[PDB]
Amino acid sequence: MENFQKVEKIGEYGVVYKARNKLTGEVVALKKIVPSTAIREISLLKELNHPNIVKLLDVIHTENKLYLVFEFLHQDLKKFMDASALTGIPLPLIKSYLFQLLQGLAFCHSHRVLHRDLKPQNLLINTEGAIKLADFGLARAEVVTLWYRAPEILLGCKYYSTAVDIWSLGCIFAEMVTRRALFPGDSEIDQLFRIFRTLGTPDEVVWPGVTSMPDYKPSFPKWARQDFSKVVPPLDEDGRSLLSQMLHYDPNKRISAKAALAHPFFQDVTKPVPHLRL
Ligand SMILES: CN(C)C[C@H](O)COc1ccc(Nc2cc(Nc3c(F)cccc3F)ncn2)cc1
């Protein structure tokens, strides 16, 4: 660590600082998290390189402590959304960001690597119009937000799939469009019930096997499903169609990142440059 000079606290899996490499002069994001199985899993992530994945530069395991050195980006999506709350992020930019994130997920998923905790706070953007996934697969290696958690996780599924990331991204997509969180639960049951109140309480018809999930209770209230025209206006039909497929209850019916990239919604995708105030 003597090789790094902290500049400021970027945020809080451990604290993260903006730091400078005393030798190279490189500015990076330093995350202070040591078990062995962890060292191995982390080492694998160092090879998981993609333009839409925040690059893990180095893994420093010294003094029985673990430090992760990441490429540095100046802003996260949460901050950009708050900064664009009065006017809303332009649809072309929303589409560009969604498309890029799906490319990133398609890559990770093709390597059987899941993110597991996607949220606006770990989606980083730069002046070039790029957006990148941060904190990827470290979940396998303050109050935690439940807003983007897939229903199968909330219902006790222990061996969930890549589908959980598609669900989280769908929630973020809706949030960019409406400028309000889709399912802002403040407890596990509030989160589950908010989802049920919007998409309808799941049953064996739409989700075979749901009534046998660990935390499923026959006593769950039965709410009717709401129309997406009401959930995310003024998203057009292509966008609503895609969102509906990203929010399918059955993880096996939920659209994959690869298939989502071919959805008609992206027929006119472009790469606009955002207006960033750094
Ligand atoms: C309260 N508010 C004023 C603070 C700012 O919004 C904070 O603004 C920010 C937000 C993000 C960055 N850049 C990062 C973060 C990161 N890792 C990383 C992450 F992105 C999320 C969680 C864990 C991580 F390790 N890796 C690389 N570059 C800088 C400044």
Short mmCIF file of C-alpha atoms and ligand atoms in Angstrom, two decimals:
data_model
loop_
_atom_site.label_atom_id
_atom_site.label_comp_id
_atom_site.label_asym_id
_atom_site.label_seq_id
_atom_site.Cartn_x
_atom_site.Cartn_y
_atom_site.Cartn_z
CA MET A 1 0.00 0.00 0.00
CA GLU A 2 2.93 2.38 0.44
CA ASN A 3 2.79 2.49 -3.37
CA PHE A 4 -0.51 4.37 -3.23
CA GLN A 5 -1.58 7.79 -1.99
CA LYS A 6 -5.24 8.15 -1.04
CA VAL A 7 -6.93 11.23 -2.46
CA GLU A 8 -10.47 10.89 -1.13
CA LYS A 9 -13.17 8.42 -0.09
CA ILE A 10 -15.22 7.34 -3.10
CA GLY A 11 -17.70 5.38 -1.00
CA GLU A 12 -18.36 2.18 0.92
CA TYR A 13 -17.58 -5.00 0.85
CA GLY A 14 -15.14 -2.41 2.16
CA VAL A 15 -14.18 1.24 1.78
CA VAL A 16 -13.12 2.60 -1.62
CA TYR A 17 -10.71 5.47 -2.20
CA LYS A 18 -9.56 7.45 -5.20
CA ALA A 19 -5.79 6.99 -5.10
CA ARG A 20 -2.71 7.72 -7.13
CA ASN A 21 0.05 5.13 -7.93
CA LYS A 22 3.18 6.80 -6.50
CA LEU A 23 5.26 5.06 -9.17
CA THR A 24 3.21 5.29 -12.38
CA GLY A 25 1.21 8.36 -11.39
CA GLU A 26 -1.87 6.41 -12.39
CA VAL A 27 -5.15 7.42 -10.73
CA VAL A 28 -7.15 4.43 -9.55
CA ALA A 29 -9.99 3.29 -7.31
CA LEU A 30 -8.56 1.43 -4.31
CA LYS A 31 -10.89 -0.95 -2.50
CA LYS A 32 -9.88 -2.28 0.91
CA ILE A 33 -11.68 -5.55 1.61
CA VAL A 34 -7.51 -13.32 3.95
CA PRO A 35 -9.06 -16.66 2.88
CA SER A 36 -7.48 -18.62 0.02
CA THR A 37 -10.59 -19.60 -1.96
CA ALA A 38 -11.12 -15.85 -2.18
CA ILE A 39 -7.64 -15.19 -3.57
CA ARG A 40 -8.28 -17.74 -6.33
CA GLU A 41 -11.70 -16.41 -7.34
CA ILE A 42 -10.39 -12.85 -7.33
CA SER A 43 -7.42 -13.88 -9.48
CA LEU A 44 -9.86 -15.19 -12.08
CA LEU A 45 -11.68 -11.86 -12.29
CA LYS A 46 -8.39 -10.22 -13.26
CA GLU A 47 -8.67 -12.03 -16.60
CA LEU A 48 -12.33 -11.12 -17.12
CA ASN A 49 -11.60 -8.09 -19.31
CA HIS A 50 -14.25 -6.31 -21.38
CA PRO A 51 -14.86 -2.67 -22.43
CA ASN A 52 -18.02 -2.55 -20.32
CA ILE A 53 -16.48 -4.08 -17.20
CA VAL A 54 -14.42 -1.90 -14.86
CA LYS A 55 -10.91 -3.30 -15.22
CA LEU A 56 -9.36 -4.94 -12.17
CA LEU A 57 -5.78 -3.67 -12.46
CA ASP A 58 -4.19 -5.51 -9.55
CA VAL A 59 -4.89 -7.64 -6.50
CA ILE A 60 -2.63 -6.78 -3.58
CA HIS A 61 -2.54 -9.39 -0.84
CA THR A 62 -0.12 -8.17 1.83
CA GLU A 63 -0.06 -8.05 5.63
CA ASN A 64 -2.87 -10.62 5.53
CA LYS A 65 -5.15 -7.93 4.06
CA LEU A 66 -6.71 -7.63 0.60
CA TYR A 67 -6.69 -4.59 -1.69
CA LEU A 68 -8.28 -4.40 -5.12
CA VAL A 69 -7.00 -1.78 -7.55
CA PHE A 70 -9.55 -0.81 -10.19
CA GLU A 71 -9.50 1.47 -13.22
CA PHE A 72 -10.99 4.82 -12.11
CA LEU A 73 -14.19 6.37 -13.51
CA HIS A 74 -15.43 9.78 -12.38
CA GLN A 75 -19.14 9.22 -11.90
CA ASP A 76 -21.70 6.52 -11.19
CA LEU A 77 -25.20 6.18 -12.68
CA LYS A 78 -26.92 7.04 -9.40
CA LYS A 79 -25.29 10.43 -9.38
CA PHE A 80 -25.98 10.98 -13.06
CA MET A 81 -29.64 10.08 -12.57
CA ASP A 82 -30.01 12.49 -9.65
CA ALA A 83 -28.32 15.15 -11.79
CA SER A 84 -30.77 14.41 -14.62
CA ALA A 85 -33.88 14.15 -12.42
CA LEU A 86 -35.46 17.44 -13.53
CA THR A 87 -35.19 16.67 -17.25
CA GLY A 88 -34.59 12.93 -17.39
CA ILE A 89 -31.88 11.05 -19.25
CA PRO A 90 -32.52 11.28 -23.02
CA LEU A 91 -33.97 8.04 -24.43
CA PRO A 92 -31.07 7.55 -26.87
CA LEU A 93 -28.62 7.63 -23.96
CA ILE A 94 -30.78 5.29 -21.86
CA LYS A 95 -30.83 2.89 -24.80
CA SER A 96 -27.07 3.20 -25.32
CA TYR A 97 -26.40 2.50 -21.64
CA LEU A 98 -28.80 -0.47 -21.56
CA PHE A 99 -27.22 -1.91 -24.73
CA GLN A 100 -23.69 -1.56 -23.34
CA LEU A 101 -24.60 -3.09 -20.00
CA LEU A 102 -26.20 -6.03 -21.80
CA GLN A 103 -22.98 -6.52 -23.79
CA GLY A 104 -21.07 -6.55 -20.51
CA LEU A 105 -23.47 -9.05 -18.96
CA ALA A 106 -23.44 -11.26 -22.06
CA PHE A 107 -19.65 -11.42 -21.73
CA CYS A 108 -19.62 -12.23 -18.01
CA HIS A 109 -22.43 -14.75 -18.34
CA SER A 110 -20.66 -16.53 -21.20
CA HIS A 111 -17.85 -17.07 -18.67
CA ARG A 112 -20.35 -18.30 -16.06
CA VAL A 113 -19.64 -15.24 -13.91
CA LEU A 114 -22.58 -13.47 -12.25
CA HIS A 115 -22.64 -9.99 -10.76
CA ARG A 116 -25.44 -10.70 -8.24
CA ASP A 117 -25.78 -7.12 -6.95
CA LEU A 118 -26.29 -4.70 -9.82
CA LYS A 119 -27.42 -1.22 -8.79
CA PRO A 120 -26.99 2.34 -10.08
CA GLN A 121 -24.16 2.87 -7.58
CA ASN A 122 -21.96 0.24 -9.23
CA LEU A 123 -22.60 1.27 -12.84
CA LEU A 124 -19.88 3.77 -13.78
CA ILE A 125 -19.85 6.24 -16.65
CA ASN A 126 -17.27 8.35 -18.45
CA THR A 127 -17.20 11.36 -20.76
CA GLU A 128 -16.99 9.17 -23.88
CA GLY A 129 -20.50 7.82 -23.43
CA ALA A 130 -19.38 4.50 -22.02
CA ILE A 131 -20.91 2.75 -19.02
CA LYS A 132 -19.25 -0.08 -17.08
CA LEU A 133 -20.13 -2.79 -14.56
CA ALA A 134 -18.25 -2.53 -11.25
CA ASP A 135 -17.78 -5.03 -8.40
CA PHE A 136 -18.27 -8.04 -10.72
CA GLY A 137 -18.37 -11.56 -9.22
CA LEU A 138 -16.80 -10.40 -5.97
CA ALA A 139 -20.09 -11.55 -4.44
CA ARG A 140 -18.93 -15.08 -5.19
CA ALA A 141 -15.35 -14.38 -4.13
CA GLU A 142 -24.81 0.93 5.74
CA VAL A 143 -28.08 -0.77 4.78
CA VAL A 144 -27.84 -3.01 1.71
CA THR A 145 -30.39 -2.04 -0.94
CA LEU A 146 -32.94 -4.68 -1.90
CA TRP A 147 -34.52 -2.66 -4.70
CA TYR A 148 -32.88 -4.62 -7.50
CA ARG A 149 -33.03 -8.12 -6.05
CA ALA A 150 -34.64 -10.81 -8.21
CA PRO A 151 -37.72 -12.59 -6.80
CA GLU A 152 -36.07 -16.02 -6.80
CA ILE A 153 -33.41 -14.71 -4.41
CA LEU A 154 -36.09 -13.21 -2.17
CA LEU A 155 -37.97 -16.53 -2.22
CA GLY A 156 -34.96 -18.49 -1.00
CA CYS A 157 -33.50 -20.00 -4.16
CA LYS A 158 -29.95 -20.97 -3.16
CA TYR A 159 -28.66 -21.75 -6.65
CA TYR A 160 -29.89 -18.85 -8.75
CA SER A 161 -28.64 -18.09 -12.27
CA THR A 162 -27.41 -15.37 -14.59
CA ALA A 163 -31.08 -14.38 -14.79
CA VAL A 164 -30.77 -12.46 -11.51
CA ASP A 165 -28.60 -9.86 -13.27
CA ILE A 166 -31.12 -9.41 -16.09
CA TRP A 167 -33.80 -8.72 -13.46
CA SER A 168 -31.65 -6.10 -11.73
CA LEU A 169 -30.86 -4.44 -15.04
CA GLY A 170 -34.55 -4.39 -15.94
CA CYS A 171 -35.29 -2.52 -12.68
CA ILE A 172 -32.53 -0.02 -13.48
CA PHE A 173 -33.85 0.40 -17.05
CA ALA A 174 -37.32 1.29 -15.65
CA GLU A 175 -35.75 3.71 -13.15
CA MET A 176 -33.83 5.59 -15.84
CA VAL A 177 -37.04 5.95 -17.84
CA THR A 178 -39.42 7.03 -15.07
CA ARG A 179 -36.92 8.79 -12.80
CA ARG A 180 -38.14 6.81 -9.79
CA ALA A 181 -37.16 3.41 -8.39
CA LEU A 182 -39.41 0.60 -9.61
CA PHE A 183 -39.53 -1.49 -6.41
CA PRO A 184 -38.11 0.52 -3.47
CA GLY A 185 -38.60 -2.01 -0.67
CA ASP A 186 -37.17 -1.39 2.79
CA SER A 187 -37.38 -4.99 4.03
CA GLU A 188 -37.34 -8.37 2.28
CA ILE A 189 -41.10 -8.85 2.52
CA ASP A 190 -41.83 -5.24 1.53
CA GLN A 191 -39.60 -5.79 -1.51
CA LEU A 192 -41.35 -9.03 -2.41
CA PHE A 193 -44.81 -7.53 -1.93
CA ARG A 194 -43.98 -4.42 -3.97
CA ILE A 195 -43.00 -6.72 -6.83
CA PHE A 196 -46.21 -8.75 -6.40
CA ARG A 197 -48.36 -5.62 -6.34
CA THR A 198 -47.00 -4.55 -9.72
CA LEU A 199 -46.39 -7.80 -11.58
CA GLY A 200 -49.07 -9.83 -9.80
CA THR A 201 -48.56 -12.50 -7.15
CA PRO A 202 -46.79 -15.36 -8.95
CA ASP A 203 -48.44 -18.77 -9.22
CA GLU A 204 -47.75 -22.15 -10.81
CA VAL A 205 -49.18 -20.93 -14.12
CA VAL A 206 -46.62 -18.18 -14.76
CA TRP A 207 -43.85 -19.69 -12.64
CA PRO A 208 -43.82 -23.50 -12.39
CA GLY A 209 -42.31 -24.52 -9.06
CA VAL A 210 -42.77 -21.17 -7.31
CA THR A 211 -45.07 -22.57 -4.61
CA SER A 212 -42.31 -24.98 -3.57
CA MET A 213 -39.65 -22.30 -3.05
CA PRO A 214 -38.06 -22.17 0.46
CA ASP A 215 -39.64 -18.89 1.53
CA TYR A 216 -42.87 -19.13 -0.42
CA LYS A 217 -45.96 -18.91 1.80
CA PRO A 218 -49.45 -19.98 0.64
CA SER A 219 -50.64 -17.09 2.80
CA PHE A 220 -49.05 -14.49 0.50
CA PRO A 221 -51.74 -12.01 -0.56
CA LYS A 222 -52.90 -12.46 -4.16
CA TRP A 223 -52.56 -9.22 -6.14
CA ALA A 224 -53.45 -8.79 -9.82
CA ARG A 225 -50.85 -7.81 -12.41
CA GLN A 226 -50.64 -4.22 -13.68
CA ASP A 227 -50.15 -3.08 -17.28
CA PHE A 228 -46.68 -1.86 -18.22
CA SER A 229 -48.29 1.11 -19.95
CA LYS A 230 -48.95 2.19 -16.45
CA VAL A 231 -45.65 1.12 -14.94
CA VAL A 232 -43.15 2.83 -17.26
CA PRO A 233 -44.64 5.57 -19.40
CA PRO A 234 -43.76 7.04 -21.72
CA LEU A 235 -41.61 4.08 -22.77
CA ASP A 236 -42.52 2.94 -26.28
CA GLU A 237 -43.83 -0.57 -27.05
CA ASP A 238 -40.41 -1.90 -28.06
CA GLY A 239 -38.99 -0.80 -24.73
CA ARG A 240 -41.95 -2.09 -22.73
CA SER A 241 -41.76 -5.43 -24.55
CA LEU A 242 -38.08 -5.78 -23.70
CA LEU A 243 -38.63 -4.72 -20.08
CA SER A 244 -41.43 -7.26 -19.71
CA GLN A 245 -39.09 -10.02 -20.85
CA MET A 246 -36.37 -8.87 -18.45
CA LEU A 247 -38.89 -8.96 -15.61
CA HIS A 248 -40.37 -12.42 -16.23
CA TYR A 249 -40.94 -14.23 -12.94
CA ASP A 250 -39.65 -17.62 -14.10
CA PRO A 251 -35.83 -17.31 -14.33
CA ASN A 252 -35.91 -19.79 -17.22
CA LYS A 253 -38.33 -17.63 -19.21
CA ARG A 254 -36.47 -14.40 -18.44
CA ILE A 255 -34.60 -13.11 -21.49
CA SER A 256 -30.84 -13.68 -21.66
CA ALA A 257 -28.40 -10.81 -22.18
CA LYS A 258 -27.45 -12.24 -25.58
CA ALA A 259 -31.05 -12.47 -26.75
CA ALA A 260 -31.86 -9.03 -25.38
CA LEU A 261 -29.15 -7.51 -27.58
CA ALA A 262 -31.08 -8.71 -30.64
CA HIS A 263 -34.38 -7.20 -29.45
CA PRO A 264 -36.02 -4.68 -31.87
CA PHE A 265 -35.58 -1.95 -29.23
CA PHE A 266 -31.93 -1.70 -30.23
CA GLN A 267 -32.48 -1.45 -33.99
CA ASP A 268 -31.67 2.27 -33.82
CA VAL A 269 -29.20 2.28 -30.94
CA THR A 270 -26.46 4.93 -31.04
CA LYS A 271 -23.76 6.12 -28.65
CA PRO A 272 -24.54 9.67 -27.44
CA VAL A 273 -22.12 11.51 -25.19
CA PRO A 274 -23.52 12.51 -21.78
CA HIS A 275 -23.20 15.97 -20.27
CA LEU A 276 -21.03 15.31 -17.24
CA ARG A 277 -20.14 17.85 -14.57
CA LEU A 278 -16.98 16.60 -12.87
C1 LIG B 1 -22.14 10.61 -1.62
N1 LIG B 1 -21.58 11.06 -2.94
C2 LIG B 1 -21.25 12.51 -2.88
C3 LIG B 1 -20.43 10.20 -3.38
C4 LIG B 1 -20.26 9.96 -4.90
O1 LIG B 1 -21.48 9.87 -5.56
C5 LIG B 1 -19.28 8.87 -5.35
O2 LIG B 1 -18.92 9.01 -6.76
C6 LIG B 1 -18.00 8.22 -7.42
C7 LIG B 1 -18.49 6.97 -7.89
C8 LIG B 1 -17.64 6.08 -8.58
C9 LIG B 1 -16.26 6.42 -8.81
N2 LIG B 1 -15.34 5.54 -9.52
C10 LIG B 1 -14.97 4.13 -9.44
C11 LIG B 1 -15.57 3.23 -8.49
C12 LIG B 1 -15.12 1.87 -8.54
N3 LIG B 1 -15.64 0.83 -7.65
C13 LIG B 1 -16.86 0.63 -6.85
C14 LIG B 1 -18.16 1.18 -7.18
F1 LIG B 1 -18.36 1.95 -8.29
C15 LIG B 1 -19.28 0.94 -6.35
C16 LIG B 1 -19.14 0.15 -5.18
C17 LIG B 1 -17.88 -0.39 -4.83
C18 LIG B 1 -16.74 -0.16 -5.66
F2 LIG B 1 -15.54 -0.70 -5.29
N4 LIG B 1 -14.19 1.48 -9.43
C19 LIG B 1 -13.70 2.40 -10.27
N5 LIG B 1 -14.04 3.69 -10.31
C20 LIG B 1 -15.77 7.67 -8.35
C21 LIG B 1 -16.63 8.56 -7.66
#
